[PDB]
Design a binder for this molecule. Sequence first.
Ligand SMILES: CSC[C@H]1O[C@@H](n2cnc3c(N)ncnc32)[C@H](O)[C@@H]1O
Ligand SMILES: CSC[C@H]1O[C@@H](n2cnc3c(N)ncnc32)[C@H](O)[C@@H]1O
Ligand SMILES: NCCCCN(CCCN)CCCN
Ligand SMILES: NCCCCN(CCCN)CCCN
Ligand SMILES: [Fe+3]
Lengths: 344, 344
Amino acid sequence: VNKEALVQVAEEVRRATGLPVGWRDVERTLGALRATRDLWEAVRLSRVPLRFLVPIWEGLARRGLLRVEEGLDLLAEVPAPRPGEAACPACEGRGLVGERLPGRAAERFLAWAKERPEAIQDFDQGYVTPESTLARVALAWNWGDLEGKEVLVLGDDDLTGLAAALTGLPKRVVVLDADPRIVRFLERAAKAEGLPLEAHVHDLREPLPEAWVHAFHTFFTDPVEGPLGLQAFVGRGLLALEGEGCAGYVGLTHVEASLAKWADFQRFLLENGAVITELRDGFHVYENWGYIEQMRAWPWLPVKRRPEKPWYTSALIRLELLRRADLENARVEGDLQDEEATTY
Amino acid sequence: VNKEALVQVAEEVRRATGLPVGWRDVERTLGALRATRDLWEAVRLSRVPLRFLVPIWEGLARRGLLRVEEGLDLLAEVPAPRPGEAACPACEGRGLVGERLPGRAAERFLAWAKERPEAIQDFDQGYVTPESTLARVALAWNWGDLEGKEVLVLGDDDLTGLAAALTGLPKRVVVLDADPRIVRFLERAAKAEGLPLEAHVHDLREPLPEAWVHAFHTFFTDPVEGPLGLQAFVGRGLLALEGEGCAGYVGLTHVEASLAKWADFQRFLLENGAVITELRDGFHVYENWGYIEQMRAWPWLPVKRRPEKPWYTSALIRLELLRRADLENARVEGDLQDEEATTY
Ligand SMILES: CSC[C@H]1O[C@@H](n2cnc3c(N)ncnc32)[C@H](O)[C@@H]1O
Ligand SMILES: CSC[C@H]1O[C@@H](n2cnc3c(N)ncnc32)[C@H](O)[C@@H]1O
Ligand SMILES: NCCCCN(CCCN)CCCN
Ligand SMILES: NCCCCN(CCCN)CCCN
Ligand SMILES: [Fe+3]
């Protein structure tokens, strides 16, 4: 198995789908399989979109490189680097530990997390682990984006708004979500804990209400990752920032976003006056959601077994505005999911 | 003290110097001072360029907000967040540890580092801690950028090329440096250890020899941070990579690079075919260099005492190419340092 075979597998997928599939996607796919036979683990190790993985794995099996039977088994030696093992086990490779947050936020958060609303398919939900939420807020603490600040959270199954308000740092936290269950849980917690936290039912496909335009110092979001979803979550966030010196925090996966789309998103940030100051890949680990067998890619999977441990992860990005972002505050029409999206 | 005051201080410096100093850099300056009275620690905690810190501190002192004596003490209550304290102590906030590197690389590297060339002012040198070098290489291991790859290191006081070769993963490592001491040390270690590591004296202001153009899969550099220096080091890096799927690792400070410059660099990268896949801020810690009293900023400092612990830090950026970068291979003419540079 030589280099050209990786190139040819990628070109085949490219020809069949119109998607930006490269030879290095194939390399990554093979690399992961040097370390595991389990499909979900292969996804986690690969750093390739699940939309790409399926036809790549098919192409590799058509060439006799891969056996697809109860597992994914490499049948040949391959020109692909094996996954490294250098993640710091103390912080799960984050660099940040949420346990250190003020106000005993970590212990108080874990109590509330035990009663959180289940992730539902109606809103593409799937929350990160409590440690992930707390570390996300710890990053914001470290960069000075919580204390005395006005914080907006756009979608909050992760309960970032709650963790942030439990630290005792923000001036106030406002959460928007389409799901009344999330809104109500946050309002309940806000009342019981005496927090300056408010939550509102709002669908981000509609314009942002004028009270929230250029009114915040800091936003958090873990958005739907089609370009329209990026616009509706991250563009609203940028519109919500007062301007220069304000910060945003964004969750971004490989599972549903190609490196080509990573670049497009980075261009979108730079052209709207932002700059990236942190990008910690694999920072968030997601809890398995109940609706996995009803998601888009399920029927395509070569092995179909419910996952028993976490597999879906995302990066944390920190951005800062160098000037006010003057984005159109229009309705977003059309699908927030794109062709790369597979777990909705 | 109100937010308007922070804006005023910033505008004064901006007007006096022509540099892009904003209110948030003042806020960051003040926040650091809430946490420490030590100048070097204030620089570390600020995430602001030293070029900006000097005139911000002086402006704060003229306003009766800062006392400068044997330390730096705030004289009023200020609207600035304290930097948080959530970095993982096990990995020094990096999320990666060099210890599990293959080949006994960590232990072997530490032996060699005991005999390394000391940093000299003639080449603006200052090496990272041995664990920083090893962590950098471990990030590359984790991303599949070592095993069987062709590795170029552009500037190597950090000895990244030696650490990478010690893993036994690369197919070969080539190092370029203008300092013959660095080159000779690497040649010496390569022969002693029998590694596929070579080094060459090369001034990166001159064109890259053809043999190294589009020849490599991975590059590492920790560059001079004026725009010309970024062209001489990172641009040559980009030109050295074969193309799509090849990676680069770049060190980038706040101490000598403003966020306006960070954005211009990120633009430069996206426009020439790259995408950022990691940006771990504060990843590298630098050892203190012997010529600190002879560096540009020393006479300006409001308090002058030699540092006793590390203070100068940089981010580690991983980029990947989405396509070949066809940059010009011309002479770089002019100063690699710019007005934001202060440690040369
Ligand atoms: C995308 S999943 C993250 C969060 O976004 C919320 N969400 C999903 N779609 C939308 C939408 N169109 N507008 C607002 N919130 C949404 C979810 O209910 C969840 O809490
Ligand atoms: C900038 S310090 C990092 C490394 O770059 C090297 N260096 C500095 N200037 C040049 C240059 N013009 N060409 C090549 N290497 C350089 C130094 O010797 C050091 O090892
Ligand atoms: N469909 C379930 C898995 C996708 C979850 N997405 C929303 C997560 C919200 N916490 C991932 C978003 C990645 N940006
Ligand atoms: N001049 C004192 C220290 C300079 C550090 N610069 C060179 C470091 C090389 N290991 C910083 C480079 C930052 N990109
Ligand atoms: Fe750690």
